[PDB]
């Protein structure tokens, strides 16, 4: 099964350089060219270059030429891309994909998982977790909706669970959004009115990068 | 470069439907056109190569055709595992260029959000912040408009909106909107209102709390 394993440096500061790697396996490395593609989160796909490890060598998209250096190491069977002087426009997901000839042109037939490049100013910060209990005029009358707000963390991801995972129906966890260079997300669980506050409901959030674990029980009032 | 245009950029279809995605190039591409599928959470796969017509080993419901500048991908009976973003790529000249993408979603009966608003938790207020949160849950279509009103006026500053992906079970979306203010500003006002405008009601759906009926 041919396979292409990526990772390079993912969190960097403006002015930095990163060298990413794409390790191929499952086929003779020398026999196929490697291509690198950028996906800037607002979806489109952009071609950066091609590197043939066997048959001589290299092309760059005019745009990426100079900011990018593509090398290979034929003996570890790895392709690399180097980005110099990284700005905000360089934050994206970078994929490497293999070319295969089929009568006339090339198909990019296997692709790596991609490595996210986050150019940032922010440091590892643990989230603040605040329980969100229904307010004032009694609210959510049939089912009750409760939430959890996970406020200033860096980097992604955080994992949010409700009752250590026992409560997994009714839950909505919203994609995090970057506020001033830190992430904020939320999760809601809708429960029967007979469940709370008679039974305990707790949101459990884990932030693997700061080794933080927080348990916040949702209780009446504010 | 050769500019590649996919129409449409979004397509809603019912499960079981025959879907067609089109891709046009700025000059004749000589049939060197490849199509790719990007699943939710980003993996990408080759589906079809050389001018649509050749299948890589994807389901047989994927096929493609075309000549010159205009190519098509068609899925003959839509499955749930097919909602994805699809990309055409021309392989006739350097730079290899890609189409802008077509995203698929499952068309459903309209639903209408269940809205809730949450006052700042006391814990946040001890740190001098006050975020007010509004969950808008399980609605279809995805288009919704949210405005915040404080004692009768502005929405605008400090609001962060986040949307979920379409739910694989039922086929809805959900959204949270969060207004952040400082505790000081929070205590100079009385009502906070989350107002949603969805094409499912002519009257906004409103949720509010007044600060000291708490």
Curated annotation (Swiss-Prot), chain B:
GO cellular component: extracellular region; plasma membrane
One Pfam family recorded for the sequence: C1-set
Residue stretches making up the Ig-like domain: 113-210
Keywords, ordered alphabetically: Disulfide bond, Immunoglobulin domain
Listed GO biological process terms: B cell differentiation
Xref: Gene3D superfamilies: Immunoglobulins (2.60.40.10)
SUPFAM superfamilies xrefs: Immunoglobulin
Disulfide bond is among the record's keywords: yes
Glycosyltransferase recorded as keyword: no
Sequence intervals crossing the membrane: none
SMART domains linked: IGc1
InterPro entries reported for this sequence: Ig-like_dom, Ig-like_dom_sf, Ig-like_fold, Ig/MHC_CS, Ig_C1-set, Immune_Resp_Modulators
Disulfide bonds: 134-194
Protein name: Immunoglobulin kappa constant
Organism of provenance: Mus musculus
């Amino acid at each position: 099964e041919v396979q292409l394993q990526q990772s390079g440096v993912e969190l960097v500061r403006a002015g930095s350089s990163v060298k990413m790697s794409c390790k191929a396996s499952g086929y003779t490395f020398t026999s196929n060219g490697i291509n690198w593609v950028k996906q800037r989160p607002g979806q489109g796909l952009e071609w950066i270059g091609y590197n043939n490890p066997g048959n001589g060598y290299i092309a760059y998209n005019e745009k990426f030429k100079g900011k990018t250096t593509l090398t290979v190491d034929k003996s570890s069977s790895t392709a690399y891309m180097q980005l110099r002087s990284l700005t905000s426009e360089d934050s994206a997901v970078y994929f490497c994909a293999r070319s295969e000839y089929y009568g006339g042109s090339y198909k990019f037939d296997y692709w790596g998982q991609g490595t996210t490049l986050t150019v940032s100013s922010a440091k590892t910060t643990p989230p603040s977790v605040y329980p969100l209990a229904p307010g004032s005029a009694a609210q959510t009358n049939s089912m009750v909706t409760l939430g959890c707000l996970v406020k200033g963390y860096f980097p992604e991801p955080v994992t949010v669970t409700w009752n250590s995972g026992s409560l997994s129906s009714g839950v909505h966890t919203f994609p995090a959004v970057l506020q001033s260079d830190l992430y904020t997300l939320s999760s809601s669980v809708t429960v029967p009115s007979s469940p709370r506050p008679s039974e305990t409901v707790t949101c459990n959030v884990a932030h693997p990068a700061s080794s933080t674990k927080v348990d916040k029980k949702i209780v009446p009032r504010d | 470069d050769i500019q590649m245009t996919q129409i449409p950029s979004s397509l809603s279809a019912s499960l079981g439907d025959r879907v067609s995605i089109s891709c046009r190039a700025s000059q004749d591409i000589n049939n060197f056109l490849n199509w790719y599928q990007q699943k939710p959470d980003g993996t990408i796969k080759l589906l079809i190569y050389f001018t649509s017509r050749s299948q890589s080993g994807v389901p047989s419901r994927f096929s493609g055709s075309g000549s010159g500048t205009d190519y098509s991908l068609t899925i003959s009976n839509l499955e749930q595992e097919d909602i994805a973003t699809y990309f055409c790529q021309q392989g006739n000249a350097l730079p290899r260029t890609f189409g802008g993408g077509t995203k698929l979603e499952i068309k459903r009966a309209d639903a209408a959000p269940t809205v809730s608003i949450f006052p700042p938790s006391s814990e946040q207020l001890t740190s001098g912040g006050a975020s007010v949160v509004c969950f808008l849950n399980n609605f279809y279509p995805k288009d919704i408009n949210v405005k915040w009103k404080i004692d009768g006026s502005e929405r605008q500053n400090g609001v962060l909106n986040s949307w979920t992906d379409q739910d694989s079970k039922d086929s809805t979306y959900s959204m949270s909107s969060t207004l952040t203010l400082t505790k000081d500003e929070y205590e100079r006002h009385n009502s906070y209102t989350c107002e949603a405008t969805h094409k499912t009601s002519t009257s906004p759906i409103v949720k509010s709390f007044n600060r000291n009926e708490c």
